[PDB]
Curated annotation (Swiss-Prot):
It is found in: Cell membrane. Forms disulfide-linked homodimers at the cell surface. Interacts with LCK. Interacts with PTK2/FAK1. Binds to P4HB/PDI. Interacts with IL16; this interaction induces a CD4-dependent signaling in lymphocytes. Interacts (via Ig-like V-type domain) with MHCII alpha chain (via alpha-2 domain) and beta chain (via beta-2 domain); this interaction increases the affinity of TCR for peptide-MHCII. CD4 oligomerization via Ig-like C2-type 2 and 3 domains appears to be required for stable binding to MHCII and adhesion between T cells and APCs. Interacts with Aedes aegypti long form salivary protein D7L2. It comes from Homo sapiens. Highly expressed in T-helper cells. The presence of CD4 is a hallmark of T-helper cells which are specialized in the activation and growth of cytotoxic T-cells, regulation of B cells, or activation of phagocytes. CD4 is also present in other immune cells such as macrophages, dendritic cells or NK cells. The chain holds residues 428 to 444 of 458 of the full protein. Palmitoylation and association with LCK contribute to the enrichment of CD4 in lipid rafts. Phosphorylated by PKC; phosphorylation at Ser-6 plays an important role for CD4 internalization. Integral membrane glycoprotein that plays an essential role in the immune response and serves multiple functions in responses against both external and internal offenses. In T-cells, functions primarily as a coreceptor for MHC class II molecule:peptide complex. The antigens presented by class II peptides are derived from extracellular proteins while class I peptides are derived from cytosolic proteins. Interacts simultaneously with the T-cell receptor (TCR) and the MHC class II presented by antigen presenting cells (APCs). The modification Phosphoserine is found at residues 6, 13. It is linked to Immunodeficiency 79: An autosomal recessive disorder characterized by childhood onset of recurrent and recalcitrant skin warts due to uncontrolled viral infection with human papillomavirus (HPV). Some patients may also have recurrent respiratory infections. Laboratory studies show a complete absence of CD4+ T cells. The Ig-like V-type domain mediates the interaction with MHCII. This is T-cell surface glycoprotein CD4.
Amino acid sequence: QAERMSQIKRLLSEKKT
């Protein structure tokens, strides 16, 4: 729900953390 646990899995996105 949070942009936290999902954030760890968006390493494939263009430029996100």
